[PDB]
Amino acid sequence: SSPFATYEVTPVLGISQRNGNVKSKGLQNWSIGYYIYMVSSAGLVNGLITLELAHDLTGASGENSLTSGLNFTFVLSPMYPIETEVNLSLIVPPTVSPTNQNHVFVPNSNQSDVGYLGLPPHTRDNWYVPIDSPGLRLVSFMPTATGNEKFGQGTLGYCAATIQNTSSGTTPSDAIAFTVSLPQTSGSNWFDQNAPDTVVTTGPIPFSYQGYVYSP
């Protein structure tokens, strides 16, 4: 019997089925493709997150990706759907091994001491996380885009988050916030025309945090 707990989530048709949701810095809701794989070893979680945007984004009148960059937040509630109430980024249910060991991947209470990132409970609410938010663990990477779209050095910030003011009045388990900045060097305005074939990926970004201990 495996000593590991595992967590895997991606759209049923894979990362190119962009049916997740991210909150932009402009408070727009963007479609996202995601692939997340995490392994728990004696309560320590190591993970990889991949996020893919298509060139179909909504920005403000006169806003240009070439000046603003692509800045957005993905939030994972590992207890979903054992806890059904919170799913900001509209994930499908994860594959968890063993079955229903989702709580193993909830960030431990010590992942948010002194202060904590607090988020509202609904996809429509304002849960954009600034890239310089207190508590973020910061990672650097070069994204990859199709054709003539060129992106500079990207940043991901991640941390535990508490979800506040749920409709039921029940305290949800903690979530993990992933906030991304992709500065754009050249190409087109990602906020203007729908170009569904034109895609940028973060590639698989590593992260690590403390959850709860799985023991077989």
Contact set with a copy of itself (CB under 8 A): 2-4, 6, 15, 35, 37-39, 41-44, 46-48, 50, 52, 97, 110-111, 113-115, 132-146, 151-153, 157, 159, 199-201, 203-210, 215
Least Å distance, CB 157 to a copy of itself, is 7
- Name the residue nearer to a copy of itself (CB basis): 44 or 60: 44
Q: What pairing do the DSSP bridges indicate for beta strands 154-163 and 117-119?
A: parallel
DSSP-based three-state secondary structure for 189: coil
- Name the residue nearer to a copy of itself (CB basis): 121 or 211: 211
- Name the residue nearer to a copy of itself (CB basis): 48 or 66: 48
- Name the residue nearer to a copy of itself (CB basis): 41 or 193: 41
What's the CA gap between 76 and 119, in Å, rounded? 12
Least Å distance, CB 123 to a copy of itself, is 25
Least Å distance, CB 102 to a copy of itself, is 16
What's the CA gap between 57 and 117, in Å, rounded? 26
- Name the residue nearer to a copy of itself (CB basis): 38 or 76: 38
CB 77 within 8 A of CB 175: yes
Residue in 73, 81, 85, 91 with CA at minimum distance from that of residue 131: 73
Least Å distance, CB 5 to a copy of itself, is 9
CB 58 within 8 A of CB 49: no
For 156, list phi and psi in degrees, rounded to 5.
-120, 135
- Name the residue nearer to a copy of itself (CB basis): 36 or 75: 36
For residue 5 the two structure tokens come to 């707990």
Least Å distance, CB 60 to a copy of itself, is 26
Distances (CA, A) of 204 to 1, 70, 86, 101: 28, 18, 25, 24
CB 147 within 8 A of CB 123: no
Least Å distance, CB 84 to a copy of itself, is 27
